Design a binder for these strands. Structure first.
Length: 191
RNA sequence: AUAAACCGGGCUCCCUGUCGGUUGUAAUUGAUAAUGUUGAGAGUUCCCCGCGCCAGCGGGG
């Protein structure tokens, strides 16, 4: 039930695209992160939960850092923040084809607010109950030796805890696809 | 293989010493950038793997 929480910046040099953000992060030490200021002159402000202590490098400067244990009392309401990409997985309507030889599957984003909220309450399950949520819409992110696109949503709001351990390893494992591209990290805060 | 052939114009040498370009000088008065406008709609998001009851669900990029 332990972790390392850090405030990390990545020089705008490498931070030009997601792939190099995740790279720059890897070279500090798995882990999870939330982008807080994507493109400043100094570079890119990122919050970082991890299992290992980070050590500042030429590309990714560690501002401040501290180690944390989780003690959450069930029944207590909390503020939360989560950046993630709600999806549905279907079979291609373009009827494109897989490598093995039958048709491809595609992850499409959920584009209705109700569906997104639903997706949230679903994924956190009986760990907590969302009491108040606002599903912040974000501009799509692309990435470039692979290449594609992911559509994120940023939930902020108020949950009530129902099962502390469950919730805790939700926090430590992450919620939703695309963990290595800014998603997953759930941050909690006292009411 | 020609008024041709063979066939050096060649040796020595400070241009040197002296020298304020200097005093004086508002660029200054006048001047709306102003009228008019849903961002709406839309689940395609590219690769690997697991589970699938083929509705999809999940892990990793």
């Amino acid at each position: 039930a332990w972790m390392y929480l850090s405030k990390v910046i990545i020089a705008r040099a490498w931070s030009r695209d997601l792939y190099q953000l995740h790279q720059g992060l890897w070279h500090l030490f798995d882990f999870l992160f939330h982008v807080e200021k994507r493109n400043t002159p100094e570079g890119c402000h990122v919050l970082l939960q991890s299992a290992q202590m980070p050590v500042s490098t030429a590309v990714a400067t560690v501002i401040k850092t501290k180690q944390v244990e989780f003690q959450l009392q069930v029944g207590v309401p909390l503020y939360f923040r989560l950046r993630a990409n709600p999806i549905k997985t279907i079979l291609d309507n373009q009827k494109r084809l897989d490598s093995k030889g039958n048709i491809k599957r595609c992850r499409v984003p959920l584009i209705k607010e109700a569906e997104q909220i639903a997706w949230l309450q679903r994924k956190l399950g009986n760990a907590a109950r969302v009491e108040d949520v606002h599903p912040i819409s974000e501009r799509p992110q692309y990435f470039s030796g692979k290449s594609g696109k992911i559509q994120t949503v940023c939930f902020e709001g108020v949950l009530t805890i129902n099962d502390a351990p469950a919730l805790i390893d939700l926090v430590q494992q992450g919620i939703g696809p695309a963990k290595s591209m800014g998603c997953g990290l759930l941050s909690l805060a006292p009411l």
